[PDB]
Ligand binder design. Structure first.
Ligand SMILES: OC1CCN(Cc2ccsc2)CC1
Ligand SMILES: OC1CCN(Cc2ccsc2)CC1
Lengths: 304, 304
């Protein structure tokens, strides 16, 4: 019993983190097989980041300008290319700790673990969600760029996020491992405002189910609702619309608890309308939206 | 910027987790050098756990009854002893992945990371605090016993917790790695009630400082207080007394923010007396007490 914001074990990713230095900039890279992936803004001086022309800046760079260190051992760079907003540094040595891996581009509302790193060294691990506005609310200081977000399926690491920047509001933006930003953000030191940070409704419901499984039941009410009625309330509270795809995904939690998805919607409706009246659910005073239905099943079933 | 409930990178501990089987019971053990540490209740049948006599149960056990598997490779048990509530299984092979480590007995209010494991396989990592009543609020299903709590200081893992049981209230109890329970709990299937779960005041203050550093400042007020006055309020709200030792430990956070510890106490006083009026601090609607002053400095400074 008990329910925690739980990150994937980080060891498989720890074995992939290296330091990349270009001129006076040091950040993190991800060493998989004989390629090191890092943010392309590693090549940029302060003045460059006003309006950086990455193709033009890279013309001035050679293989030997990219200093790649794995622990205290230097890797030999034998090639480099830009793919969208990431650099791929070909090194002469395959990472011997390379896990089975995939590169995945996640959808908003999907959760993943971040291994926060500085100088290619891990400092900690936490669980994130891709916000509906394609920001993440991370914990990143200078030097943390190139830190990655991932999911693990038994022995296969799915890399979904590489950290590139903090917005002036202190929320975080980055790319998939093909170098494509989540959301409309660009790797430039310019005013970039995030859109509405809405609540991930399907995740809230999953977490309400987690609460019931763990014996927190005070919020279960006598009511039901419809998808359309619930959605009227959801929009009023800056909650994402709930679709039948979301209802389908909640089916196993519905089955285990015997609480119909639309009944749980009516419980969530009353919580939105009434607030929590100073009560807590799984030790939270707000409705938690950074657990997916898959996260709840996994944690509640004990998948390794 | 940003502030997250952050676990230590778990790789060094992942490399220590093995499966221990005695008869039909499988749980986790910790393989350090040529010793595997596990909960002694591995030897117990259902009927044993009413009033188990561990010395008498162990007389019926031999080395070859303890099945120890590290990944898919069996370890040869060449000796076994009981130390308090843990078994130490001497194996013929030193764990080649043994990190620099210490065994530490932590104080209530200290935080640590748990690597939740099943069949010697890691499922996830989260950050805990030892509650003032010497319980932890974990996420543990059947098979998770022998999962460990730890801190990391650069390359040295300090092991502080081994998981042994869930109380009928769904909170967790366990031992240090010398096998001594935190709190008054025993490894027996009997009514055991936890004492008052008070709030770790010094941690709340550390987290208020973290909030200020991250730009969440709405709760800072025009007031100050005294240790005695604050403590009167603290006792009324089931907060741990604050001592000058706690004030001393908050000194670096006081210094960085320029907010005197007793002023932050007066902010916390008003939050206790007034509540949060539907506002949040670092995305929490309650006062977070599972960050130590050391945790706040570490996360806010980027220690690897
Ligand atoms: O000058 C270098 C260090 C600081 N970074 C900041 C940044 C701004 C947009 S994306 C990354 C840029 C490169
Ligand atoms: O029968 C075995 C499996 C279940 N455990 C439960 C337990 C009760 C007190 S401590 C651990 C005991 C041994």
């Amino acid at each position: 019993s008990g329910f925690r914001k739980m990150a994937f074990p980080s060891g498989k990713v720890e074995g992939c983190m290296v330091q990349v230095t270009c001129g006076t900039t040091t950040l993190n890279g991800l060493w998989l097989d004989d390629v090191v992936y890092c943010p392309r803004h590693v090549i940029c001086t302060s003045e460059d980041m006003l309006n950086p022309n990455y193709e033009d800046l890279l013309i001035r760079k050679s293989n030997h300008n990219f200093l790649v260190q794995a622990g205290n051992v230097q890797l030999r760079v034998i090639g480099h290319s830009m793919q969208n907003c990431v650099l791929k540094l070909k090194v002469d040595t395959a990472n011997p700790k390379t896990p089975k891996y995939k590169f995945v581009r996640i959808q908003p509302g999907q959760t993943f673990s971040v291994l926060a790193c500085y100088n290619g060294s891990p400092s900690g691990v936490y669980q994130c969600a891709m916000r509906p506005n394609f920001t993440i609310k991370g914990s990143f200081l200078n030097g943390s760029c190139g830190s990655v977000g991932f999911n693990i399926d038994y022995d296969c690491v799915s890399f979904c996020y590489m950290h590139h920047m903090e917005l002036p509001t202190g929320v975080h933006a980055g790319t998939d491992l093909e170098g494509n930003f989540y959301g409309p953000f660009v790797d430039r030191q310019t005013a970039q405002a995030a859109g509405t940070d809405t609540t991930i409704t399907v995740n809230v419901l999953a977490w309400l189910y987690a609460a019931v499984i763990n014996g927190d039941r005070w919020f279960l009410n006598r009511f039901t609702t419809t998808l359309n009625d619930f959605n009227l309330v959801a929009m009023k509270y800056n909650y994402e619309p709930l679709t039948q795809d979301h209802v389908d995904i909640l089916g196993p939690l519905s089955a285990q608890t015997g609480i119909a998805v639309l009944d749980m919607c009516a419980s969530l409706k009353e919580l939105l309308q009434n607030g929590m009246n100073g009560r807590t659910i799984l030790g939270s005073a707000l409705l938690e939206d950074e657990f997916t239905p898959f996260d709840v099943v996994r944690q509640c079933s004990g998948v390794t």
